[PDB]
Amino acid sequence: QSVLTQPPSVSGAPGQKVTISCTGSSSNIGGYDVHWYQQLPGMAPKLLIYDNNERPSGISDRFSGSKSATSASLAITGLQTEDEADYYCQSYDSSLNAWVFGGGTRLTVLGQPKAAPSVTLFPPSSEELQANKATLVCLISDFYPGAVTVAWKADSSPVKAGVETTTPSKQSNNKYAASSYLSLTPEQWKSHRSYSCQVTHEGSTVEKTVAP
């Protein structure tokens, strides 16, 4: 899928160093220079490093690149909240005769206090039930950092079917929000004592449950 290889994610406290690896082969990095792009959310990729270690005008010296044999590396010092973005390496492959990219590394800057999520669980409305559908809605908010997993139970038994969960999204207050939906038949809704939405955050669990 992607010819160059990067770690999917790195993270750091403000002020610290992070390093992002880009691994290739003799057919790409072994023969060609490596360039690096910083993609802020909603933006086109922005050239961050070119020709292994050069910076475009405007790019801070906190960003440095290096290349070695068949890999390349992007070093970031004095990590800032502004550095939160996706980082891509790029080169060219002579075997493929094609430009090649790394799969990207998501950098998170831990610029807020850790916070457990608030969890609100809504039962199906009578209107949806009359449409012979049923959706439980689990709303998760004000957690930090922005990574949760959601587990649904019917009574005590887990349900994986019909579960749809958004990725976390940054609120206006810089904490995160997410939602999870459990689709049921109205029969399924009525035929259990309860349904639970369990949200796991940093190895801690917050749970809400509702009942017909």
């Binding site: 070119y50 094609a98 409305s125 559908k133 908010s141 958004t166 999204s169």
Partner: protein, 224 residues
């Protein structure tokens, strides 16, 4: 100074074809190769190919060989990328990015100048207005409280929808969540509003949901 201005954002059906444009200004169009780079949402960058603006000559990435046509209109300084036989996995942001100078034997191969990118959404789904359902106040899930009530905006296509409360009069304590995409190919979202318990029965709460693509407006009163 140099600007790459893109167009062609849309929602397509699988099997169809899309043509995205990239108009170059601020330099002599014919002096630099033009490249196309796609990015499926949440995913990485994918080189599609390049075009020589002077000659019209092209080189396509392997993956797209059977399906892509890159052209140029030198008189409008515009490069075109047409992708055919679209399927859902062609859902992506399509960027044009300027390459190295055409005549140079050893030219640069990073991308400094990018177009803003154009979203192409490929889905079998047809335009569908949402069903709106009230999320009746669960008093025992807002510790402290207050209490949160809301509106579920279910099964619409395509994005976006917008929601307000009380025709926009109520704005505080309002949280409208990012939509989710379901197996049906349809989207759903919720909007919730955190509110003083004693004010539940004294008004009250009406969610106004606008889905422009389907010309649907729903005003849902949420009773406790």
């Amino acid at each position: 100074e140099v600007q790459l201005v893109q167009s062609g954002a849309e929602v397509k059906k699988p099997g169809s074809s899309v043509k995205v444009s990239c108009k170059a200004s601020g330099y002599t169009f014919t002096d630099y190769y033009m490249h196309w780079v796609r990015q499926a949402p949440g995913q990485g960058l994918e080189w599609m190919g390049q075009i020589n603006p002077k000659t019209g000559g092209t080189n396509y990435a392997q993956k797209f060989q059977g399906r892509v046509t890159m052209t140029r209109d030198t008189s409008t300084s515009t490069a075109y990328m047409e992708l055919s036989s679209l399927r859902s996995e062609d859902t992506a942001i399509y960027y044009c990015a300027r390459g190295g100078q055409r005549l140079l034997l050893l030219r640069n191969y990073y991308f400094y100048y990018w177009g803003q990118g154009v979203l192409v959404t490929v889905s079998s789904a047809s335009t569908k207005g949402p069903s709106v359902f009230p999320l009746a106040p669960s008093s025992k899930s807002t510790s402290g409280g207050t209490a949160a009530l809301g509106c579920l905006v279910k099964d619409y296509f395509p994005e976006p929808v917008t929601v307000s409360w009380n025709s926009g009069a109520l704005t505080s304590g309002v949280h409208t969540f990012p939509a989710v995409l379901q197996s049906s190919g349809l989207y759903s979202l919720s909007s919730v509003v955190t509110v003083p318990s004693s004010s539940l029965g004294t008004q009250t709460y009406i969610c106004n949901v606008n889905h422009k693509p389907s010309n649907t407006k729903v005003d849902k009163r949420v009773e406790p």
